[PDB]
């Protein structure tokens, strides 16, 4: 069919290219609707549904049957924050920042925010706790790199606020997730392995200052950590990057300081 | 024959889907082969028989 045109320059190649534009337009519509199963319908800055919802309608709900008898999850579904947001409107007009009413790191707002996940430990495929301390882990040991256990923990203010005691390990993935840092008060906090930089002789935590180490949310059980506790810990530490900028001694922090 | 027992071995749903797709694909393939040949191109056969071409 070389040069065979049904009409004008339209031929088999022209047939295919237009038919794909129709397919691609349909496919982009399908992909976008699937992305609308979370965070929708939209809401006003107060909490009421907005007059605008987008050109793409919501998809027909689908149900995820969670593992280990945790139940089912149907999305799109009614989603609620399930926590008081300690934020204050800074302007009646929308599209303006909300300032924290008090201490944002303690109030869990902004970069220090967290979500009301299920207050249960995350399970592996066998039903055991995915994240366990290396002491309670069976056979786990440091295989390479500098062992952070026993190293002093230095905050962003260049002050030592404790030392590492234990490492928490994701048992299926077999990689470290948390550092169990013991403070000066005898209690041990959890620090995500992604927020620390194990140097030659110390654990430098650029996120938090020495005084803020005590403020990390604690775990209910020393042998396991729930999803909710992970979010509070991960939120608090990562919230320290913006909310401990005045306490950071870095040169770039001073340049970007207010 | 006792060929009915194959439905105890094979799931009817999957088999029927396989038959439909295979028969359709086979039907298209033979028709496309025939059109490809200068002979058996019944569009061209009718054109020559009734002198459609001018």
């Amino acid at each position: 069919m070389v040069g065979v045109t049904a009409f004008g320059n339209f031929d088999l190649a022209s047939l295919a290219i237009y038919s794909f534009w129709i397919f691609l337009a349909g496919l982009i519509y399908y992909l976008q609707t699937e992305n609308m199963r979370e965070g929708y319908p939209l809401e006003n800055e107060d909490g009421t549904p907005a007059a605008n919802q987008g050109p793409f309608p919501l998809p027909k709900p689908k149900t995820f049957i969670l593992p280990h008898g945790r139940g089912t999850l149907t999305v799109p579904g009614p989603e609620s924050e399930d926590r008081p947001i300690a934020l204050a409107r800074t302007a009646v007009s929308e599209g303006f920042p909300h300032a924290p009413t008090g201490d944002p790191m303690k109030d869990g707002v902004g970069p220090a925010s967290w979500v009301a996940r299920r207050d249960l430990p995350e399970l592996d495929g066998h039903g055991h706790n995915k994240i366990k301390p290396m002491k309670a882990a069976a056979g786990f040991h440091v295989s390479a790199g500098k062992n952070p256990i026993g190293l002093p923990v230095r905050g962003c203010d260049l002050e030592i606020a404790g030392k590492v005691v234990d490492i928490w390990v994701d048992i299926p993935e077999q990689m470290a997730r948390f550092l169990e840092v013991e403070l000066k008060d005898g209690s041990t906090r959890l620090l995500p392995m992604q927020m620390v930089k194990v140097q030659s002789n110390r654990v430098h935590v650029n996120a938090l200052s020495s005084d803020l180490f005590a403020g990390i949310p604690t775990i209910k059980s020393p042998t396991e950590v729930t999803l909710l506790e992970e979010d509070k810990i991960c939120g608090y530490v990562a919230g320290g990057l913006m909310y401990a900028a005045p306490k950071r001694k870095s040169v770039v922090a001073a340049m970007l300081a207010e | 024959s006792k060929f009915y027992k194959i439905w105890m071995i094979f799931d009817p749903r999957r088999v029927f889907v396989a038959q439909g797709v295979f028969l359709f694909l086979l039907a298209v393939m033979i028709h496309l082969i025939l059109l490809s040949t200068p002979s058996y191109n019944w569009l061209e056969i009718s054109a020559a028989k009734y002198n459609r071409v001018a």
Partner: protein, 281 residues
């Protein structure tokens, strides 16, 4: 215009320039200082492309081509009708890109996430600046850059590619093509695996990360892990771009002959350059 969870993350701070002067949201977009620069450079760049269509005398979007200045003008200014517009658009495009990356930086600080995304985007910009700025400057002519046309910037690729014979023999190109193919292979595998573990056979429970590792261990005997695959995705893409930027910055600057001629060094190694038989001699 807010998601069901967006409110608690909308707080001041994290801005690099301007403080609260531009710290506001227009719909879903966050504006920032660099977003204002983004919109201006984006709008100005788009209009000059449309205005360049007027000067060219065509309105077909595929025929629209903002050619760079001819080789006679070297690396100086050019008349707007014959290359000067391209220089303004390139400056606008460069401004829009870097402002976009820096706007992403402000959003990173406001959310407290890492700067991997703007660092990943900066690799693309340096890839872009390689073609329009770094390579033409070394070759001493804006005309070695590519026109801002849908099908005329392909003519540049084909013409530049065939300047050096078959461009496939570019060794940095072979590295980058292997990375681009590998990254797409990884993305298809990674996307399909999670969907298979999240949208399993009807009635069966949503699968766990262990099934993801079990599937690929039963398949190819090794699972890189959820953390590894996203590290792999980032590094495969950046390496592909890094070697693609490298492949062009050495072409016409350090290597000038056909790239197939380059590969004869391996054939001409001292211990087998003269052995009879085979393909070469």
């Amino acid at each position: 215009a807010l998601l069901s969870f967006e409110r608690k993350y909308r707080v001041p701070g994290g801005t690099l320039v301007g403080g609260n002067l531009f710290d506001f949201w227009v719909g879903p977009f966050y504006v920032g200082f660099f977003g204002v620069a983004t919109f201006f450079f984006a709008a100005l760049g788009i209009i000059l492309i449309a205005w360049s269509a007027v000067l060219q005398g065509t309105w077909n979007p595929q025929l629209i081509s903002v050619y760079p200045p001819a080789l006679e003008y070297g690396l100086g200014g050019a008349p707007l009708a014959k290359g000067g517009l391209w220089q303004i658009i390139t400056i606008c495009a460069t401004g829009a890109f870097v402002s976009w990356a820096l706007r992403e930086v402000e959003i990173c600080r406001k959310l407290g996430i890492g700067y991997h995304i703007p660092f990943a985007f900066a690799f693309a910009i340096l890839a872009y600046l390689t073609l329009v700025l770094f390579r033409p400057v070394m070759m001493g002519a804006w005309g070695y850059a590519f026109p801002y046309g849908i099908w005329t910037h392909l003519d540049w690729v084909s013409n530049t590619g065939y300047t050096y014979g078959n461009f496939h023999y570019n060794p940095a190109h072979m590295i980058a093509i292997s990375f681009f193919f590998t990254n797409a292979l990884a993305l298809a595998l990674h996307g399909a695996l999670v969907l298979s573990a999240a949208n399993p056979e009807k009635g069966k429970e949503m699968r766990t990360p262990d099934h993801e590792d079990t599937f690929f261990r039963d398949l190819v005997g090794y699972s890189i892990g959820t953390l590894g695959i996203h590290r792999l995705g980032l590094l495969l893409s950046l390496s592909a771009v890094f070697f693609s930027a490298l492949c062009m910055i050495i072409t016409g600057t350090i290597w000038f002959d056909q790239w197939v001629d380059w590969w004869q060094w391996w054939v001409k190694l001292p211990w087998w350059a003269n052995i009879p038989g085979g393909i070469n001699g």
